[PDB]
């Protein structure tokens, strides 16, 4: 029950490396009090977070946001890792209901750029 809510997303999964174009269609937001927080319940005590990179010029007409994926904590993993993503207000740290997101391994040694 809140003022924040994630509705759509051209993508629900990306690479553990991070830095990929992801379109999020949301509810009411102000280009300077909103953030795309990714997290994961460590399960033992602590927790993990990572925030989507995006300038306020990216938060289109208050109901959309284009952003980049925050490199997952452990970049080295041979098995997909499932986390969560939620919108959050810097002011009252109000939080949108969470949606699931999948982090998967970086291509077998990406350095196959041809050298």
């Amino acid at each position: 029950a809140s003022n924040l809510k994630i509705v759509r997303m051209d993508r629900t999964a990306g690479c553990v490396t991070g830095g990929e174009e992801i379109y999020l269609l949301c509810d009411k937001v102000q280009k300077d009090d909103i953030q795309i927080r990714f997290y994961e319940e460590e399960e033992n005590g602590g927790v993990w977070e990572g925030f989507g990179d995006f300038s306020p010029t990216d938060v289109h007409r208050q109901f959309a946001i284009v952003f980049k994926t925050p490199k997952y904590k452990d970049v080295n993993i041979t098995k997909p890792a499932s986390v969560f993503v939620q919108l959050r207000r810097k002011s009252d740290l109000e939080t949108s209901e969470p949606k699931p997101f999948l982090y998967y391994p970086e291509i077998k040694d990406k350095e196959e750029v041809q050298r």
């Binding site: 289109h60 007409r61 959309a64």
Partner: protein, 101 residues
């Protein structure tokens, strides 16, 4: 009068076979009268999407329309523009190129 425009698109290229799903941010549009269109020199294709697929008049989730020449063997760039159903008014076209294979 009310210049409809497209702020950006999540993709710049896709399969010339179409059916691919994209997102586009744009200035207010009435979910009823509005439609995305791909065009070239002699061709025009209306993208597929439903009223429900327009998000608070600022974005539209739609599927790229199959190209005319489903056999091109070279990157065919075309124009992408909004266009109300009523008055026919468009929007500055965006560059979207279809891919071979």
């Amino acid at each position: 009068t009310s210049e409809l425009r497209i702020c950006r698109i999540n993709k710049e290229s896709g399969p010339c076979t179409g059916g691919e799903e994209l997102y586009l941010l744009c200035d207010k549009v009435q979910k009823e009268d509005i439609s995305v269109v791909f065009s070239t020199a002699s061709w025009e294709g209306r993208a597929d999407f439903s009223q429900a697929d327009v998000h608070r008049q600022i974005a539209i989730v739609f599927k790229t329309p199959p190209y005319e020449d489903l056999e091109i063997s070279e990157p065919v760039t075309v124009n992408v523009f909004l266009q109300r159903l009523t008055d026919g008014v468009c929007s500055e076209p965006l560059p979207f190129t279809y891919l071979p294979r």
